[PDB]
Symmetry: C7
Subunit: 29 residues, 7 copies
Amino acid sequence: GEIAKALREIAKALREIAWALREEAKALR
Amino acid sequence: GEIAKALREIAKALREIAWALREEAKALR
Amino acid sequence: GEIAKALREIAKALREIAWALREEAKALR
Amino acid sequence: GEIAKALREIAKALREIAWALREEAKALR
Amino acid sequence: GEIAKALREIAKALREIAWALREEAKALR
Amino acid sequence: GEIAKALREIAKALREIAWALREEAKALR
Amino acid sequence: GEIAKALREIAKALREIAWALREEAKA
């Protein structure tokens, strides 16, 4: 339901943050 | 309904943190 | 209710982290 | 109640993270 | 059930963020 | 209960992240 | 029990993030 959907949307935004950090780690090397 | 809406608000804030990190990354020429 | 209001306070605190990260990016460039 | 209080405590810890990031942004300056 | 599964997806995305932060450190050093 | 106890543990892990970031700001300065 | 277990798993991943930040500051 709606609460579980919103928690999955939180997990996706956290994966979005991880993609940006993996990009920064590439650029730093 | 208010609980699910506040969780979606948390996901939106986390997407805003991802956007700020993309700009930090780009932010080193 | 009280749980919804506390979740809204968590979203506000995450928006305060996004502002700070944007300021970090502006300080390097 | 105890769940709502713990959620408010998570929001307080996130504000401590924002405060430390704001300080780093002034340090980079 | 579905709420518990979504919380586990959140923990895994946080583990991805930790791996990316470790890699930023290693790129520097 | 067990849920409130786990939420308090999440708040302490976030205070632990803020300690590490305050030390990084103290060093930069 | 499964929701509380998943919340403790989140706290453990946050402690792993605090450890990675300490290692970033050493560099």
